[PDB]
C-alpha cells in the first residue's frame, strides 16, 4: 500500500495513481516575487463559532481531528470561493528533523510542519461526491514553525499517547479549532489536488501567509506516533508530506499586496 517509506514513497505513488503527474498537482512552491497580488479576491471567512468537534484518529498516514459536518456548524466561505465549504477534519503533516515537514514551500523554505483544514463544497451534498469536482474541497493550509508553544493545540498533544498507532481512535469533543489560527487571514490560493493517494484534482488551496509558533515538545510528541499497527514493529510517524509538484499551467494569486 503507498505510505512515505523508500519503497511505497511519493515517487511510486504513480504506479498506482497516475494522476500523480497530472496538470494541477499539489503541493507546490509558493514563490512570493511570482505571486500576483489579486485585489478582486476577498477577505476568507472563517465562522467556526459552533464547531463539533467528534474523534481523533490515527489513520496510518496523519491523525485526522473529525467533525460533525451533517449541517452548517463549521463553515468556510469568502477568499476565492463561491458558496459555503463545510470543516469535515483537519490534520497535520510533519518532518523527523525542524528544517523539513510540511508540504507547500515558501520560496523554497521549508517549514516544520503544516495544518490542513478540510473544507468541502455544500452544493455537492456529501465529501464524496465533493471529491469528484473540480470546485469540491478548499484546504485551509497553515504552516508551524518551531519557537512559542501554541496553547490551543495541547488538547491535541495530551492525547496522542492514546491513538498511537493505525487504527487507534479516541472521543475528542469540544475542541476549538480556532485556537489552531494565525493573527492574520492573508493568503496565497491556487487550484491543486489533494497529497496523498487518491490525489485528486478537487482543491481550492487557500494557504495562510503567517505560520502558527508551536513549541519543539509539541511537535517531539507528533514525532512519537506510529505509522504501525499495535503489536507490529515501530516506524515513527514522522515525514509524512510529499514535496512540491510541478506548478505547469497554474497561477498563485495573492490576497495582499
Ligand atoms: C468519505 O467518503 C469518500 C471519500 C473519498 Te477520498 C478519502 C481519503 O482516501 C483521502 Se481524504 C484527504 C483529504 C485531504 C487531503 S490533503 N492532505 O489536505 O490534501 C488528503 C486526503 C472518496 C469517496 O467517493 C468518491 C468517498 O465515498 C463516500
Ligand atoms: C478560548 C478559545 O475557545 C480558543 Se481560541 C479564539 C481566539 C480568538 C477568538 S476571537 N477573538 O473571537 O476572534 C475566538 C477564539
Ligand atoms: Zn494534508
Not at 188 to 198: D, E, F, I, K, V
Not at 212 to 237: A, H, Y
Not at 247 to 254: C, G, H, S, T, V
Request: charged share 25%; net charge neutral.
Amino acid at each position: 500500500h503507498w505510505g512515505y517509506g523508500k519503497h511505497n514513497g511519493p515517487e511510486h505513488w504513480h504506479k498506482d495513481f497516475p494522476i500523480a503527474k497530472g496538470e494541477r498537482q499539489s503541493p507546490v512552491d509558493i514563490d512570493t516575487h511570482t505571486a500576483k497580488y489579486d485585489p478582486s479576491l476577498k477577505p476568507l471567512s472563517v465562522s467556526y463559532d459552533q464547531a463539533t468537534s467528534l474523534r481523533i484518529l490515527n489513520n496510518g498516514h496523519a491523525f485526522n481531528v473529525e467533525f460533525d459536518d451533517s449541517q452548517d456548524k463549521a463553515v468556510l466561505k469568502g477568499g476565492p470561493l463561491d458558496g459555503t465549504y463545510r470543516l469535515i477534519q483537519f490534520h497535520f503533516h510533519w518532518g523527523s528533523l525542524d528544517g523539513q515537514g510540511s508540504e507547500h514551500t515558501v520560496d523554497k523554505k521549508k517549514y516544520a510542519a503544516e495544518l490542513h483544514l478540510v473544507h468541502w463544497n455544500t452544493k455537492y451534498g456529501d465529501f464524496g461526491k465533493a471529491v469528484q469536482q473540480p470546485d469540491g474541497l478548499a484546504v485551509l493550509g497553515i504552516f508551524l514553525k518551531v519557537g512559542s508553544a501554541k496553547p490551543g493545540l495541547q488538547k491535541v498533544v495530551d492525547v496522542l499517547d492514546s491513538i498511537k498507532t493505525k487504527g487507534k481512535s479516541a472521543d475528542f469533543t469540544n475542541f476549538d479549532p480556532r485556537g489552531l489560527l494565525p493573527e492574520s487571514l492573508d493568503y496565497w490560493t491556487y487550484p491543486g489536488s489533494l497529497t496523498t493517494p487518491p490525489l485528486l484534482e478537487c482543491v481550492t488551496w487557500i494557504v495562510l501567509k503567517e505560520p502558527i509558533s508551536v513549541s519543539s515538545e509539541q511537535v517531539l510528541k507528533f514525532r512519537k506516533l506510529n505509522f504501525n499497527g499495535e503489536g507490529e514493529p515501530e516506524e515513527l510517524m514522522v515525514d509524512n508530506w510529499r514535496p512540491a509538484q510541478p506548478l505547469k499551467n497554474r497561477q498563485i494569486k495573492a490576497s495582499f499586496k
